[PDB]
Structures are given as structure tokens and as C-alpha cells.
Design an enzyme around this catalytic site. Structure first.
Site, PDB file in Angstrom:
ATOM      1  N   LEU A  43      -7.502  22.478  50.338  1.00  0.00           N
ATOM      2  CA  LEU A  43      -7.793  21.323  51.179  1.00  0.00           C
ATOM      3  C   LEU A  43      -7.019  21.329  52.493  1.00  0.00           C
TER       4      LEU A  43
ATOM      5  N   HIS B 251      -8.595  18.426  55.240  1.00  0.00           N
ATOM      6  CA  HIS B 251      -8.144  17.057  55.045  1.00  0.00           C
ATOM      7  C   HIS B 251      -6.723  16.949  55.581  1.00  0.00           C
TER       8      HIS B 251
ATOM      9  N   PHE C 101      -7.552  10.112  49.070  1.00  0.00           N
ATOM     10  CA  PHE C 101      -7.273  11.157  48.098  1.00  0.00           C
ATOM     11  C   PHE C 101      -5.784  11.170  47.767  1.00  0.00           C
TER      12      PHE C 101
ATOM     13  N   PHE D 279      -6.141  18.388  39.697  1.00  0.00           N
ATOM     14  CA  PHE D 279      -6.488  18.688  41.081  1.00  0.00           C
ATOM     15  C   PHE D 279      -6.388  17.479  41.994  1.00  0.00           C
TER      16      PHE D 279
ATOM     17  N   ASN E  22     -12.837  14.112  53.990  1.00  0.00           N
ATOM     18  CA  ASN E  22     -14.046  13.936  54.775  1.00  0.00           C
ATOM     19  C   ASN E  22     -15.083  14.970  54.377  1.00  0.00           C
TER      20      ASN E  22
ATOM     21  N   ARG F  26     -13.702  10.048  42.175  1.00  0.00           N
ATOM     22  CA  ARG F  26     -13.548  11.444  41.780  1.00  0.00           C
ATOM     23  C   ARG F  26     -12.199  11.678  41.117  1.00  0.00           C
TER      24      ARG F  26
ATOM     25  N   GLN G  94      -9.393  10.707  43.743  1.00  0.00           N
ATOM     26  CA  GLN G  94      -9.966  10.237  44.991  1.00  0.00           C
ATOM     27  C   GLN G  94     -10.740   8.957  44.747  1.00  0.00           C
TER      28      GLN G  94
END
Lengths: 320, 34, 212, 49, 114, 158, 98
Positions: free
Chosen positions: F114, F118, F105, F52, F94, F47, F55
Site C-alpha cells: 500500500l 495510500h 484504513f 492485513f 483510495n 473491509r 478499513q
């Protein structure tokens, strides 16, 4: 260096046929090996016996230079292609044209047949090739993308199925179904007029006045050079035993070893009596089906047949 | 006003091909007038 | 003289349709394309110039005058980054033409981007070009001091072009800058490299001159 | 969920649209890199020849 | 004191003339080790990139620099403009040429038929 | 066993991330054991959200793989004051609490969204310009970007 | 301490406990959308200039653009099963599909 090349015996001329009235531009051998066929710039197609060298028959349909002939292995057909932009299908049970493929916009320089499916591929000077359907005369694909006359085309059953060399100095490997170029090879500096595929090795070679080059399928990875023949090269032709014949346009013909690229003979034949010496040139060469004879079609209106020399040995003709 | 391809010269870039972009930023570049 | 807006616009139209019909007429010899783009740049309408050069390269991209005129036009008009993208495309698609590497490096030097010039020289030397290119690289290293880089280049160089003459030049280089131990090492390496079966005069002559 | 049904074609209907329009051919594909061997030199005498 | 000479020859390839011109231009340039060291102490190891080794996005030039290359551009452009030296309109000799295209064709014929 | 700076020299640039075990002992130990374990070699960025997140670290490269050093996954080790307020906060994401596995990440900007889902477990002490470059790259519509950017070397601090 | 200039980062790092948007080593700030395409790098840290020639093309395209494509591969071997045509069964499959 290299391991050392295999020893091949050298070839000697043993027959000279002369009955054409213009340059002889294409030559082919029947499947069953009894006769061969020549097409010439006097617009006829002559059919000769391969044992005796006698002329069996003369077919006259074209309007200009016949620049390619081929004989199909699956059907009793001979496909010819001329400078009159027309491509013909002669049926050899009546000796008459039964089918003609229309659509090229300038002279057709060469043509090949697919070995399993029934299609034709032709290359022409409008800088396109076309994939014709043998049975319905319909053009199923126009392979376009070259930027100058398309000198030569060869097709195969494996993949990629079509290799074209053109006069813009480029080779392209195409896919038959999709109809577009996968790979473009720009290593040559001068027009690629000759392409040949090894019978049993998934490799191929391409000839140009610079030097012959070898490439490896299916994405054309370079392998090696073959240099020494500095002449406009009109043909390449490979034996099953790794002999590679490179016929030039000033008459001179080199014979090479395919695997190591070692030029083991150079033939410089002589011109027919009434010819000038500026008129020696080889336009096509073809191995017999037994791969014993080598026929060449020349710019002095003769067909010269070479056979291998049987009385020579590694010590009579050593390998440098 | 009846000419098919005339304004193909003075109104618009006749057949515009914009340069390809590579490894550098061409954004801030702009040029002067006459 | 053109009073104003409508008359010079008609003047533009006439010249422009003249150019475009020439191009339609032949579509080949690039004298037309270049004349045209030169004019549209002389009027400071350079987006039209860029479009013209691009269309021309679509016609025949192997033509080196086209690339040179193009990058020159971009460079005069101070469009530095456009010129960089152009030089990069040019040396990518026509890597054997040496002018492109020369001029790309020269520009980057003028602009003060010496790191950039070294990047380009390195990319160039990947192609194992020719003695003159290696010399140009070394001279570039010598306008700045960086002599250790120069000898690194020379190491790669004499391997790429193993001629006695180059070994001579290498030794001569290091002596001119007074690295005498190193030049001795150069000469001994030269002899042991070449081997007897080739070895001839010129090398020994220079070796004797040095030790003399 | 939608029901596609194809509309009948009238047998006696001539073509509807003008086919023959001409335009210049598109740009080709991205030029491939010219992988040559380095050029050699022609002396003045050869260019004389 | 110093001394050298360089004679002109056949244009043999455009590459030869280009190379001569590059030689001249290269010899001209004079670099400032001041700015070099200044640029050096900022970036250090980035200074010595292989073809493939290192990367920093873009080096943005002060305009004053850009003026240097622009000026050199104009200079080389002029020097190139003077490539062909024209021979002055001399009417003194016999005229067997209808127009200037014909006059030049007659001159090319003079150089190939002696 | 708390490796200070885990060096993950990606293809596109060098990296070494500092994990605060005092705030995140469980995930710091997990990530160190993974980096010294060398299992992260071959993990393609699953990702990339421009400005942003980056990941990656998935043994599938799709997002339905990944395992932890205590089995498949374990719970989160929350911090009260550690957040995603700035780039490089290394927090294993997660799809549901107490199921954080191998996936890694790296923030690229303030990610206060987040926070709480996370566990911010450190910050990347090497290669932040490279992180920005990887964050600028153009991605496909599935955040598996067009470039198969992978880590060359995965190892921890000595 | 609230780090405002990236010098306060030392070797870099964001302070998650510091209620400031940390921009360490060019971090945080969304930049202008520039045209430069992604300066990719190979699986060893080399600069993959294959990109600029491959401009706007699929990955089916095989693009020869490196010096190492010119060098003669030493395939002077009559034996290697690397180069032998596909077994005629695969050829039969290709023929049927075509």
C-alpha cells in the site's frame, strides 16, 4: 401494582347435561350457534342442541377415545381425532365419514383448522405435528422437534401460524410454509397442556401447573404471569371481553381478567350423583358464539353450562 | 471379512461428535496415552 | 491377562459393542452413557469419551449429572480450556442450576484466576439468584481483603433481597470490621427504608445492641 | 454458454435404486437456554410425604 | 480458642448437600496475597470487571497451579466415593431372602410395613 | 487545528489515533474535522483482511460512499519516508489518486504494498490489542465481516 | 533509534519512518490459528454471551438467554396500538403467498 381491573360479573351454573358413558374430552360450537358437539371416551360423538340441551344425534365411528372435535367455518365438515391414531372428516350433509388422514404413529391429542387456507394441523404423542391438506389427505409437513408428546396445537392466519405446547415443557412457534420452528419458549417447568390466542390483541397465553403465562406475538416476548391456580390445567378459553377461564384437572375452575391478570371468581362444582370425589375434573371448555354461555366437559360424564349473572354489581361483588 | 457394523467400534469413533468451541483455544490441548 | 495388541483390542471390541447395544436398546437412562464414557476414559481414550458425552447431551441436555461428570472428566485430564468451555456452555443453557456456578467459580479460584472468578460471580449476580449465592460472593471477596468490594456487593444485595435480616447482616458486617459511622448510616437507612407499616422487633433489637 | 437438454425417461423402466436404508436420527438443534424461575426447597417432611 | 458445630439433616435437595460440601471446601482454601498483588500491579483496572465490562483473551496458568485443582479433584472424588456406608455382612439374623436383590427388597418392605 | 489524538471508541474497544500533520496536513485536518463532526457514528467495517487491514468509515457501509471535508474527495499528501511497514498506520485508502474521501484504513502488519497508493497519515496511539482482536474476527467473503462492529464514539483530541 | 521492544512505544505507536517492522502492543506478528471464536462485544461495550448459546445458528433464530427476558413487562394497557393484529390486508397477502 396495576390500574384497577375491569369489573366483570360472575357466572352461575344453570344446566347439567348427562348422557355420555365415558369422560367427555372435547367440545366445540357450530359457526351459526345452534348446536354443539362433544366427543367422549366412550368412542361416540354426540351432537346437542344449544338452546334446549336436547341430544340431536350420535355418531359412532371411532375405535377409541375421541380427543378432539372441530367444526369448519368454511365448509360443512366436522373433523374429529382419536386415540386410534386416526383423523376423520365427517360430512354433515350425510352424517358420514368421507375422508381420513393417515400417518400418525400414536394417539392424536388435538387438532386445529386453518381459518383461511384449507389445511389441518394435528399434534400427537409421537411428538410431531402434521399439516394436512384437507382436500387430498396428503401430509404436507411434519413439524418435528419436540422431545415428548405434543399436548396441544393452535393455528392462526397472522404470523407465526402455529403454536404447539408439549409435555417436555416447551412451547414452539412455527412457520407454516417453511415448516420449522422460529421460537422456542422454555419458561414453564411442567407440561404445557393449554394454549389460547386472544381474539383481538396479537397476544396469547399458555397454561401449566406452575402458572399461566402471557406472551406477545410474533416472537413470543414475555408479558406477565397469572398465578394462584395450582392444578394440572387442561384448558384455557378467552372471551372477547377479556374474561379468561382456566379449567383444571381436579375440577376447580378459575375465572380471571385477561388484561391485568386478576382472578375474579373460583368455581368448585359438584360431582354427579354416582361419582367418586376423585373423579371431578374438567377436560374442555368452550364459550358460546354470542360469548354468553360457557360450556364445560368434565370427567364425571356431564356437560355443565354456565351463564353470566345479571343481578350483581360492583358493590355487591367488589374487586379486591 | 463380512460384517456390516462390526468395525463401527474398534476402528473409528463410532459416531463422532466433536465438542463445540467457545471463547477459549482448545487447540494446544492434547492428552497422554495409557 | 492380556498379552498384547490383538487380545486387548478384542477385549475393547467386546466391551464396546456391549455398551453400544445397551445404548441402542434404551437411548434413555443416562446410567449407560455415563458407564460407557467412564470406561473409555479409564482407558485414557478420552476423545471417545468426549464424543460419548456430546452424544448424551444430544439425548437429554437438562440432566445435570451429565454436565458434572463431563466437566470433571475434562478437569482431571488437565484439559483446562476444554473444562472452561464446558462450564461456560453449562451456565449458559442451565442458568438456574447453582452447582454449575459454584463449581465453575471454585475451579477458577483454584487455578489462580481471581479476575476470572469475579467475572463469573458478576455474571451470576445478574440473575439475582439467592441469598446463599450473594454470601458466597462476599466470602470470596473476604478471603482476599478487598473489603470495599464487599460493601459494594452488600449494597446490591440488600436491595435485591430486602429482608430485615439482610440489613442486619450488612450492619453486622461493617461493625465486625470496625466501620462504626458507616454502620450507623446502615441502620438509619434500614429504618427509613422499611417504614412504620411493616417495622418490627428484630431490627430494633440489633440496633439497640449496636448502640449499647 | 452451454445447452441443457433433459434426457428422455424410458417408460418401461423399473426403479433403479434401493430406497430403504436405516440410520439413527441426526443430532437435534442447539439446546435452548432453560429460562426458569428459581427453584424452591422441599423440606425433609415433604419428601417423607 | 474457637468452637462450632454443624449437624447433619435430611438430604432435602441435592443442592443442600452440594452447598454444605462447598462450604467446607471454601473454608479450607488459603490464598496468597503475594501472587494477588503481583497479578494486580500488571493489570490494574482490568481486575474489577462487571459481567459485561472488560475483556482480556485468556489467562494461561502455570502447570504447578493446575496440579492444585487436580489434587483437590482427587480428594473430593474419594470423599464422594464414600457416600454410602455399607452395613457389614451379618449372617446372625434369620435368612428369608433368596439372593441379595431379594434381601434388599425385604429390607425396603421392612421400612414401609410396620 | 491539528487534533493530536482522535479518540474513536469503537464498540469492540477504545481507540485514539495520532495523525502527523507535518507529514500529512490535508488528511490530518480532514480526519480531525470528521471525528469532531460526529459523522463517523454508524460506520460499519467495510473491509477486514485478517492480519492485513481493517478499513471502515463508510456512510454506506458498502464502499461506494464516503465524502471529505473539501467536497467529495481531494488529492493525497504523500510522504517520502512514511510507510505502512507496521500495524496501525492510519491512511485513507483510495480507488484512484486524488479521490481520497471518508474511507479510513488501519494497518495490522507491514503493508509495503500500500506504499505509494495510500498516504500513511499517522498511527493508532490507543487500543492496538483491540485492533488485533478485530483483525482476528471471522469475516464473510465480502470482507463485511459477520459481526456488525461499529464505533460508539467518534471525537478528536481536545 | 529502532524500536525493538514495545516498551520503546511508550503509549504505543508504529514508526512509519523507521525501517523496522513495528510490533507495538502485540502488533505485526501473525499468530497461531486458535479455535476460540470471536469474543464479540455489544453496541455499548458489553460481552455478548448470546454467542455461545447461538452456536452455529442463523440470525433468524430468536434466542432468549438474558435475565431481562424473565421480567414482567408492564403491558397492563387496553389501548396501546403496539399489540393489535396486522390489518386484514397484510393478512390477505400472507394468505395468498402461503
Amino acid at each position: 401494582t396495576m390500574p384497577k381491573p375491569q369489573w366483570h360479573p360472575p357466572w352461575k351454573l344453570y344446566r347439567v347435561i348427562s348422557g355420555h358413558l365415558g369422560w367427555v374430552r372435547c367440545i366445540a360450537v357450530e359457526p351459526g350457534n345452534q348446536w354443539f358437539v362433544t366427543g367422549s371416551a366412550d368412542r361416540t360423538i354426540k351432537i346437542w342442541d344449544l338452546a334446549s340441551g336436547k341430544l340431536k344425534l350420535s355418531l359412532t365411528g371411532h375405535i377409541s377415545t375421541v380427543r378432539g372435535v372441530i367444526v369448519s367455518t368454511r365448509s360443512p365438515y366436522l373433523f374429529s381425532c382419536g386415540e386410534d391414531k386416526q383423523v376423520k372428516c365427517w360430512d354433515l350433509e350425510y352424517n358420514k365419514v368421507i375422508r381420513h388422514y393417515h400417518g400418525h404413529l400414536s394417539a392424536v391429542y388435538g387438532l386445529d383448522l386453518h381459518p383461511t387456507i384449507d389445511v389441518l394441523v394435528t399434534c400427537s404423542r409421537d411428538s410431531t405435528a402434521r399439516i394436512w391438506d384437507v382436500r387430498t389427505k396428503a401430509s404436507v409437513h411434519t413439524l418435528s422437534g419436540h422431545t415428548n408428546a405434543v399436548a396441544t396445537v393452535r393455528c392462526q392466519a397472522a404470523e407465526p401460524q402455529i403454536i404447539t405446547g408439549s409435555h417436555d415443557t416447551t412451547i414452539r412457534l412455527w412457520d407454516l410454509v417453511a415448516g420449522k420452528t422460529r421460537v422456542t419458549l422454555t419458561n414453564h417447568k411442567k407440561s404445557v397442556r393449554a394454549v389460547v390466542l386472544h381474539p383481538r390483541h396479537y397476544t396469547f397465553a399458555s397454561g401449566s401447573p406452575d402458572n399461566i403465562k402471557q406472551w406477545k406475538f410474533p416472537d413470543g416476548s414475555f408479558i406477565q404471569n397469572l398465578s394462584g391456580h395450582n392444578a394440572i390445567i387442561n384448558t384455557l378459553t378467552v372471551n372477547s371481553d377479556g374474561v379468561l377461564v382456566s379449567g383444571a384437572d381436579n375440577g376447580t375452575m378459575h375465572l380471571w381478567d385477561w388484561r391485568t391478570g386478576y382472578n375474579f371468581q373460583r368455581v368448585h362444582a359438584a360431582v354427579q350423583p354416582g361419582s367418586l370425589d376423585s373423579e371431578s375434573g374438567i377436560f374442555a371448555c368452550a364459550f358460546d358464539q354470542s360469548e354468553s354461555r360457557l360450556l364445560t366437559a368434565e370427567a364425571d360424564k356431564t356437560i355443565k353450562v354456565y351463564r353470566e349473572d345479571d343481578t350483581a354489581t360492583e358493590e355487591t361483588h367488589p374487586v379486591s | 471379512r463380512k460384517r456390516k457394523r462390526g468395525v463401527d467400534y474398534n476402528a473409528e469413533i463410532p459416531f463422532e461428535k466433536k465438542p463445540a468451541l467457545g471463547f477459549y483455544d482448545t487447540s494446544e490441548e492434547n492428552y497422554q496415552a495409557l | 491377562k492380556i498379552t498384547d495388541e490383538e487380545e486387548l483390542n478384542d477385549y475393547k471390541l467386546r466391551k464396546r459393542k456391549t455398551f453400544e447395544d445397551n445404548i441402542r436398546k434404551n437411548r434413555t437412562v443416562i446410567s449407560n452413557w455415563i458407564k460407557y464414557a467412564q470406561w473409555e476414559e479409564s482407558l485414557k481414550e478420552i476423545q471417545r469419551a468426549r464424543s460419548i458425552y456430546e452424544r448424551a447431551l444430544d439425548v437429554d441436555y437438562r440432566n445435570i449429572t451429565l454436565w458434572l461428570k463431563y466437566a470433571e472428566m475434562e478437569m482431571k485430564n488437565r484439559q483446562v480450556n476444554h473444562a472452561r468451555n464446558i462450564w461456560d456452555r453449562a451456565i449458559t443453557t442451565l442458568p438456574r442450576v447453582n452447582q454449575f456456578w459454584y463449581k465453575y467459580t471454585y475451579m477458577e479460584e483454584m487455578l489462580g484466576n481471581v479476575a476470572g472468578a469475579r467475572q463469573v460471580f458478576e455474571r451470576w449476580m445478574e440473575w439475582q439468584p439467592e441469598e446463599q449465592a450473594w454470601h458466597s460472593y462476599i466470602n470470596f471477596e473476604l478471603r482476599y481483603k478487598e473489603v470495599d468490594r464487599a460493601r459494594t456487593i452488600y449494597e446490591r444485595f440488600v436491595l435485591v433481597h430486602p429482608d430485615v435480616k439482610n440489613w442486619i447482616k450488612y450492619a453486622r458486617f461493617e461493625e465486625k470490621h470496625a466501620y462504626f459511622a458507616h454502620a450507623r448510616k446502615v441502620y438509619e437507612r434500614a429504618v427509613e427504608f422499611f417504614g412504620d407499616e411493616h417495622m418490627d422487633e428484630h431490627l430494633y433489637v440489633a440496633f439497640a445492641k449496636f448502640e449499647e | 454458454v452451454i445447452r441443457m437438454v433433459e434426457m428422455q425417461k424410458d417408460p418401461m423402466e423399473p426403479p433403479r435404486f434401493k430406497i430403504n436404508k436405516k440410520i439413527p436420527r441426526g443430532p437435534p438443534s442447539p439446546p435452548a437456554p432453560v429460562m426458569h424461575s428459581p427453584s424452591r426447597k422441599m423440606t425433609v417432611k415433604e419428601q417423607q410425604e | 480458642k474457637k468452637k462450632r458445630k454443624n449437624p447433619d439433616l435430611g438430604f432435602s435437595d441435592y443442592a443442600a448437600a452440594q452447598l454444605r460440601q462447598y462450604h467446607r471446601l471454601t473454608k479450607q482454601i488459603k490464598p496468597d496475597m503475594e501472587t494477588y498483588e503481583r497479578l494486580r500491579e500488571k493489570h490494574g483496572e482490568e481486575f474489577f470487571p462487571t459481567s459485561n465490562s472488560l475483556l482480556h483473551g485468556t489467562h494461561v496458568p502455570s502447570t504447578e497451579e493446575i496440579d492444585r485443582m487436580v489434587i483437590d479433584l482427587e480428594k473430593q472424588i474419594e470423599k464422594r466415593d464414600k457416600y454410602s456406608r455399607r452395613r457389614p455382612y451379618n449372617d446372625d439374623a434369620d435368612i428369608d431372602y433368596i439372593n441379595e436383590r431379594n434381601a434388599k427388597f425385604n429390607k425396603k418392605a421392612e421400612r414401609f410395613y410396620g | 487545528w491539528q487534533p493530536p489524538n482522535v479518540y474513536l471508541e469503537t464498540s469492540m474497544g477504545i481507540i485514539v489515533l495520532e495523525l502527523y500533520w507535518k507529514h500529512a496536513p490535508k488528511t490530518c485536518k480532514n480526519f480531525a474535522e470528521l471525528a469532531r463532526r460526529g459523522y463517523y457514528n454508524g460506520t460499519k467495517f467495510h473491509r477486514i483482511i485478517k492480519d492485513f487491514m481493517i478499513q471502515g468509515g463508510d456512510p454506506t457501509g458498502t464502499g461506494r460512499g464516503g465524502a471529505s471535508i473539501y467536497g467529495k474527495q481531494f488529492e493525497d499528501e504523500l510522504h517520502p519516508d512514511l510507510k505502512f511497514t507496521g500495524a496501525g498506520i492510519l491512511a485513507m485508502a483510495n480507488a484512484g489518486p486524488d479521490t481520497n474521501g471518508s474511507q479510513f484504513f488501519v494497518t495490522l502488519a507491514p503493508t509495503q504494498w500500500l506504499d505509494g497508493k495510500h498516504t500513511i497519515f499517522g498511527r493508532v496511539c490507543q487500543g492496538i490489542g483491540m485492533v488485533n482482536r478485530v483483525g482476528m474476527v471471522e469475516t464473510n467473503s465480502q470482507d463485511r465481516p459477520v459481526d456488525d462492529v461499529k464505533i460508539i464514539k467518534a471525537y478528536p483530541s481536545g | 533509534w529502532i524500536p525493538r521492544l514495545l516498551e520503546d512505544f511508550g503509549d504505543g505507536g508504529a514508526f512509519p519512518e523507521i525501517h523496522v517492522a513495528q510490533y507495538p502492543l502485540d502488533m505485526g506478528r501473525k499468530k497461531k490459528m486458535s479455535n476460540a471464536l470471536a469474543i464479540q462485544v455489544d453496541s455499548e461495550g458489553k460481552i455478548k454471551y448470546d454467542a455461545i448459546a447461538r452456536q452455529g445458528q442463523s440470525k433468524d433464530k430468536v434466542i432468549y438467554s438474558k435475565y431481562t427476558d424473565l421480567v414482567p413487562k408492564e403491558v397492563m394497557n387496553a389501548d396501546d396500538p403496539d399489540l393489535q393484529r396486522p390489518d386484514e390486508e397484510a393478512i390477505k397477502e400472507i394468505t395468498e403467498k402461503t
